[PDB]
Assembly symmetry: C3
Homo-oligomer: 170 residues x 3
Amino acid sequence: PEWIWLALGTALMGLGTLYFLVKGMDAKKFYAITTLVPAIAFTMYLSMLLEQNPIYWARYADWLFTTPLLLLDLALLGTILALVGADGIMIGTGLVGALWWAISTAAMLYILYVLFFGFTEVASTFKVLRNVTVVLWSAYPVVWLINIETLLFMVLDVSAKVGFGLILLR
Amino acid sequence: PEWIWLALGTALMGLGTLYFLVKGMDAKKFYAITTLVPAIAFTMYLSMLLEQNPIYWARYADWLFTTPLLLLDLALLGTILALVGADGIMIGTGLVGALWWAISTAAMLYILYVLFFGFTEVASTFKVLRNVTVVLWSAYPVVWLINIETLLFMVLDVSAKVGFGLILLR
Amino acid sequence: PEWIWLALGTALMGLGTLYFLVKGMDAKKFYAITTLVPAIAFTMYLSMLLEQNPIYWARYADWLFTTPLLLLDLALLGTILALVGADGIMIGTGLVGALWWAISTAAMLYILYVLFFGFTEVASTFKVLRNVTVVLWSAYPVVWLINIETLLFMVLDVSAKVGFGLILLR
Ligand SMILES: *C/C=C(C)/C=C/C=C(C)/C=C/C1=C(C)CCCC1(C)C
Ligand SMILES: *C/C=C(C)/C=C/C=C(C)/C=C/C1=C(C)CCCC1(C)C
Ligand SMILES: *C/C=C(C)/C=C/C=C(C)/C=C/C1=C(C)CCCC1(C)C
């Protein structure tokens, strides 16, 4: 069941890498960072594609890595390290749990709140970015607690990133 | 048995994060770094709290991470990377063993000796720091070889860090 | 069978660390980096020494770590991050497989091609380096697909690194 959605997903991700790379062929820093997310996402996305116990983690792993990257990206334009700890915390939990979350959410707020504090066309970018990220991530804890698991999540990352990447080109 | 001590421990660690964070609300760099240790320590400390095989590693994992941080912190005020290798070496061993140490100790001396070479109120700080660290870590290999396992270790980290953090505020 | 070769290997690696360290007692950066490879190689090399499933990974793990280091070293004199992803990809695969490669090779070309683009006595160094690396790594995918597994690989790392390190002193 979960698979229908997943195959879709991996496909899209790869594209991202192709596109960005292609496109890419201060400014110097961005291409790399933004390119790193889709590619990483793609490999782990396909990794995942390729009952309950095993599938879960991959997401976490990919998520882990793309997260700081995403956050770094955002901040780029201790703070930094703090965020990853949280994320690391989070994966521990979920995996711990079906195979804790309380603190994860605490940590999430931190990142979110810092973002808020932090930023306050580049301006445009961060403005949109902050809200984009906020709402985007909400599905995680929301869904977590909540065909669907996979579905939703799929949307989210692609939405999150591919959309996100586009902003940079913009 | 081990638990009595452990619950105690996690509690204290969390405090650290609260306090520092709170307090925090060149100087810029320190808060982050110092704040990162207690928080990380707390999460993994609680992770551990939450027969022989499983418990062991967590310590290692947390230890791993707080170590370079601690060392980085100290140096902050290749060198760097070398140290983590050692630490990584160390975890490999202990986990390998009950679930090698010889080289670990070799590596430990390196860090210790470098510290010595390195530093030779900031001055005060490093002076105390070096000896603090030296003696502190000695229990590890000492204890390792040696209720008690957990007990001692508990003391050590808190002693090591919470005390350590305090120095920075100072 | 594999062991004969392996014991040989670990021995040589350790030497490297001793030598470099010893020797070492812009220039500042190199010693560290170059010293880090042999030592790391040695620990994991011995780790490996100390039927099919278990042995494999260690190599990967060590490989993982020495790789970016090696690459970083080369570049030192996003780019950076990209490369590790690939490597990470690669380990996933091989381990996935006997315990994917297609993309690994794709990634390898990237590193290789970037090198090419990148560099185009320091000059000498990179010139030789690029070809050295290219041919060296070819055995990996070659052998992978291909007493021998262990044999060949052994040669390669030592050849790769110990030789490589020497270049720096040079
Ligand atoms: C490309 C994917 C990205 C950028 C994913 C980011 C994910 C998070 C911040 C997930 C957080 C989670 C928690 C709050 C812990 C338990 C529930 C989770 C796992 C969904
Ligand atoms: C907050 C905790 C910290 C900063 C811990 C640091 C720990 C070490 C340097 C442990 C080293 C160990 C060895 C020498 C290998 C086998 C014996 C160990 C594991 C205790
Ligand atoms: C000191 C050892 C070093 C620097 C090793 C570097 C290794 C690689 C770049 C290995 C790549 C591999 C693939 C192309 C994936 C499946 C086949 C492998 C595993 C050999």
